[PDB]
Ligand binder design. Structure first.
Ligand SMILES: [Zn+2]
Ligand SMILES: [Zn+2]
Ligand SMILES: [Zn+2]
Ligand SMILES: [Zn+2]
Lengths: 69, 69
């Protein structure tokens, strides 16, 4: 139905595109791309320290939690 | 209806709480609170340079666009 497709699109817009699973709640402050915290933190801890979207490098001070909804 | 209340809640979560009107697309990087760009930029240009949520001061380098959805 039309209402449900709209719900699905909102859910997708709030969902991390990296895992397609957890909600967006983290920002990389070099490039300002948004993901879930777990995806960014696991990349940081494993030394895969590039933005999943645009490949910009980031370090310990370059990602932080945010709260959208 | 139940579907419509869920849509309304998603819309609200993506909407700037300051104007309750435009979509969230800006972050203050001192405190990491999120608003629309126009609300933050108009506060900056008028020298009302405190976070609408938590009152943290911010300057020219402390707010940037982000793209959620
Ligand atoms: Zn993720
Ligand atoms: Zn990036
Ligand atoms: Zn606003
Ligand atoms: Zn704030």
């Amino acid at each position: 139905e039309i209402l449900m497709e709209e719900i699905k699109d909102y859910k997708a817009r709030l969902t991390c595109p990296c895992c397609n699973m957890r909600k967006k709640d983290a920002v990389l402050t070099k490039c300002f791309h948004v993901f879930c915290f777990e995806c960014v933190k696991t990349r940081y801890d494993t030394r895969q320290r590039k933005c999943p979207k645009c490949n910009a490098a980031f370090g310990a001070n370059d990602f932080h939690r945010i709260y959208i909804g």
